[PDB]
Amino acid sequence: ATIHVDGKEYEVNGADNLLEACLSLGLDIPYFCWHPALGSVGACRQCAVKQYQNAEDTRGRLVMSCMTPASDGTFISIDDEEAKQFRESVVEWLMTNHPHDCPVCEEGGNCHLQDMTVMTGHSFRRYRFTKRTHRNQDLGPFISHEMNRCIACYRCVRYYKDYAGGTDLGVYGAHDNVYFGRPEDGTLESEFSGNLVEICPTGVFTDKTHSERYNRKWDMQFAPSICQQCSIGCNISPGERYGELRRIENRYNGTVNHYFLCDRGRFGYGYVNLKDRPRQPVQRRGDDFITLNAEQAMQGAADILRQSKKVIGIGSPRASVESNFALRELVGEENFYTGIAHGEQERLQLALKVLREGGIYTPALREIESYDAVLVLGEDVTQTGARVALAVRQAVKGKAREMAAAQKVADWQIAAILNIGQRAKHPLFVTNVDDTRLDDIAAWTYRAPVEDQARLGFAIAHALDNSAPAVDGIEPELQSKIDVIVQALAGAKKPLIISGTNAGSLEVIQAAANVAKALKGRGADVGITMIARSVNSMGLGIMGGGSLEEALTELETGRADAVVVLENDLHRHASATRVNAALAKAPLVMVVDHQRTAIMENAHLVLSAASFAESDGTVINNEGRAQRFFQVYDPAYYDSKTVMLESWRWLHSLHSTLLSREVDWTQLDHVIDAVVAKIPELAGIKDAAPDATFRIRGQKLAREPHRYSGRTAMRANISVHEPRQPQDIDTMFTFSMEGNNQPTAHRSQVPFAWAPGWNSPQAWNKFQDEVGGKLRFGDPGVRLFETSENGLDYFTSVPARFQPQDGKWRIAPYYHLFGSDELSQRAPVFQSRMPQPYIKLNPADAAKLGVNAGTRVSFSYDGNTVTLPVEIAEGLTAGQVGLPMGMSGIAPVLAGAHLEDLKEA
């Protein structure tokens, strides 16, 4: 479409309103209530522009650009006198009751309201009367509430209810006494409530975790990184100050995680700032714990490694691609073992084979919001891959979107779309061991053991395509529900099947693959999505290796007298007693880790590795996208005795000292090129980010804003002589503001969003080709594999029906967004959010055992008689015990296992 802004002709998209069309062209219109993801509601009345219908028109009409379509032949004026005075008056009306709170506000310097007050040019106060006040609510450990700063723009409630699907946030009150919050005090139990601190243009909802150790946005040193708390791989902007990770901001990736994170990835970063982390190489001599620098650690480690007959390496899915590859190239191809168990590795390799060999296109996370009918098999998505559950909610509301689009209603008229699509929504069928958080929008929820979920998946695949193997023994009511699912999936245009390795069963993934194959055989645009466990599970599966049990028996039989463990606690994937015995029997345990794990008591040498905030690397997410994360800060700038290096740097220098007796600190691009040379399946990680020689017109990319303060005083307590800024030889970024962060720079890795006049997270508008669309000059990260020309065959191994055996109890996994991650649970702020360890029981099984809700029963697994209190679960099937995976003492490897001697004690 063609519009005329201030006499200048512009070519815009006619399906967009005037606000996003003009913001895409670089025209600054003030706005509060409009968001690119939420839609247009016309509340704040800030986006006023003067519209003319003809080229020869003098009077015009003040309209809302967010509510006015960008049709062909509209002549709008933004900087007309009447429009500017009205926008200034709207800012003034918002300023009548706003508190004098900017110095004591966490949103100061990051405030959209401040930016829009300055942009309209209102700086004189003529209001002389009183300002209304509000009491504040306790919203939990994550979100701090300050209701006086609200401008009643309704972004919070629109996001929290119409987007995130939350139920405990709302609008209350009246004429000018509007309150935004909960009906009482309590924690916001939505898994995406952390996005309120960036959705809210004011300082009402603030990051309490950042408010504990608060610094302003200009004082933050930012980097582009990837969230390491699960497999989705959302792009984040970690920002630090004074040597500690202060905040995790959302980093816009129009392909993956555009505007929203989950609460685990936004508030689970506190393990980086733990004081028990290793900061030097520490060597154990008997009972003494001596501290070495890097060179003596390398020389001693290489001496003992040369004095051994075989060295094995146990990687981890928590480590990056480069560190696992450096371990593999240090110990050899045959001596490298993945740190996961045999069953976890089998499920992971099956999921990878389905993804890159099944012939079915695995969608990106933004593309999940366009699929019609969603079938989740086995996965508890909202607790393991929560952002995928958010995109599933969007795909479910796609039915109301298409129904309103059938009535010539614009895409951005979100209120009219929700009015037309009252409760009609796209079909969602979730299967789990219990009730999920998607059950409010699910067309059906199947509460059954994983064998029965797999059998239901195989029955769906057989009913969709008769060539699929049949399962006999299905009840007629279950058959009716199955044919309902089949009629919903067959009538869909873009069906989506979501499974994963967290269900603890191979047949669930096989059934999901068979359903996807049957949907593809009918000529449908089927997509499949596997949810892995850790951040780099897919990279570890692609690189491959032996299981943890093979490494454990290699250490136990004595063939391996030297074990190098890379960022693994080894109690998460195997029993603690067997691991402890194997590591105590081995005469050399050398652990490269950045968190104080339990196997460091037996470790003969500990290498203080760097976490994601202090290391560069590559991670492969659940859809096979190689994403590069960059270092945020140098740990040794403030604390001079800190010897903390990248794990791939540790292992590369260790291998160099092993071979040539010389210590060699490599570069990130050298290790990347080594991965591309040795592993052809990981060849796409070279193009994930450009190398360290990349420049924007000769200068590097700045990690901190141009108004970074305290340079000559932040280190003056140590020494009055300011040292050189740390040099980044690994990446194209610099640990200084002497660099480039323009919105029009030809790059894909943006550390943070700032524009002149745009200090809020609304500054991401300047960094996109169109607002709410893709990032300018493409999104970061590339896909490792394409969709294959041919697919797999039908998995004929249909499992038998789950029969509850007497005495033995099948362990049903219960994943928690706060608690089931290895590193997020070490954050001190997650202690007040993690649920108490409760074993879930059927009413019938608890009545048989004589247990009621609340009391404690004891169960023994591998000689560990541990006692948990009982919570009654109605939806759990009989014969199973519900256990929380990832908690203290309950490994995720316990899923699907047996449980003997379950007695009340």
Binding site: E92, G109, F124, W218, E738
Partner: protein, 589 residues
Amino acid sequence: EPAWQTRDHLDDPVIGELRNRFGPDAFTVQATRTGVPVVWIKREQLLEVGDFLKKLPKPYVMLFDLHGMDERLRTHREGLPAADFSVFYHLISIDRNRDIMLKVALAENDLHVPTFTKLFPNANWYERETWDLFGITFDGHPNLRRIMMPQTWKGHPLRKDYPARATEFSPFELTKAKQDLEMEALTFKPEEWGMKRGTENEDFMFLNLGPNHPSAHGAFRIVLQLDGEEIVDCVPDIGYHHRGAEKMGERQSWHSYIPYTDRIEYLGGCVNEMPYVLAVEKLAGITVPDRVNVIRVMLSELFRINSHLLYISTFIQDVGAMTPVFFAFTDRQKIYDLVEAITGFRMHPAWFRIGGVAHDLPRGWDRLLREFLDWMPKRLASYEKAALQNTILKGRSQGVAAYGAKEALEWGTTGAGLRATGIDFDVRKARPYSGYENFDFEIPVGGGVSDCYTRVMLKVEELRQSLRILEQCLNNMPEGPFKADHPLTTPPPKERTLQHIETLITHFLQVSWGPVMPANESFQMIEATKGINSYYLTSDGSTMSYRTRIRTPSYAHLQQIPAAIRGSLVSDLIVYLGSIDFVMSDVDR
């Protein structure tokens, strides 16, 4: 219609003459807030355009400025030719009282411009500076070497990819090898300058006058080739006082750059502050009220009297009489008492703001102004009758280092020298800024010869006229605001900031991120204490300056130095150095 509006400047007759000479498809006209016609011309026609401007009926006889600009990072270049670098030539015609700014666009690989030294002899140091800081080569230049940086310097500092801060590079480690290498670099090599270090009868004497000399007014060195006592040739070596203030202008916000403007000419103070804040107000679109103009005129005339007192005492000291410097610095202490009362600081006040001044006048400033105005004229008459009417001082001064109007125009000489050549060109009258039209004062001119004595007596008359201006402004000071009511006035008034939320928001975003001045080019030229000081500010639409070009008169005077003292004795050079009114922060910036 306000004077800060973006004017296309197609009504200037010079534009019409250029159209009728070179055709209508030979150049582009850039609409700026400089108040000067900006003409983007091709590199091939640069010398022809310069010759045409030099051969006009009322010609552009002076090269005011010549410098480069890195346009690789400039996002808003609508209506401009495509360029990775550019070179601008600011020229003045005194007869028309007009300026022009010619801009030449250069690609990143083809960074060569024809030399401008044949048309204007003062282009030599400007082209050396542009090569040193931007890497732009000038074809046909006689001796293109580094003038601000030492010869063993890698990279060009004013390029956008060069790091601005010392903390980016390694800390300064002075070793024996580095000391020897930099001492060999600092050693004068007469074969490079074609000095011809010998004669059949006798040998020439190569003497370093400076950095450590009482006659040198800073850290710079003149290398003198001598026979006996006579000067054969001089090489004034500058760059020893380089603080990187333009690169610092690219590094600070618009508000936070004001103290750095204060230290450009450290005897000037508010006189250094005025052109920068006026150019920023042109960028913002701020028209300050009458009280702001009168207060700024007050402080700049006070600091002009301070600088002239120091200059006269310094000249008398270098002639040989060591007494009047004590009394002149006592008068400087009286002015410092008033300035400490008003601004709170002695010598670098940093008191001017965008849209006004930092505070209002304190209660009782007129008492100290009356005290100084009563104390001054008797002391000045005593200085005159004791030292300035001394026949030994006249013998050391009159006829020493004399030049006419042609040498003053071809070397860009401004201030008291240009008026001492008889050319009545003062910025406060020709292009009146800050409401100088409301003050009755005279402009002293010379008889046609710019002696040391003539320049000193002209500065005495300028001091007397500044006393007259101070008396007029003391007797008539308006009762209004000390800050403008514009939203971009940085910072806003303090009490409204302390008790209103709109003012608090504006203050919060103006002192932290900086005021957002929209993308435009601005220029302000003022009459400094030592000549003409100009600020040329290119804004990219951000909160920091994209380009800050500072033109200073002491640069032109020090470049004029070899052409006016060649063939004289060293004593004439000492009197010439004492009678130029230069500081070296002014030169090297």
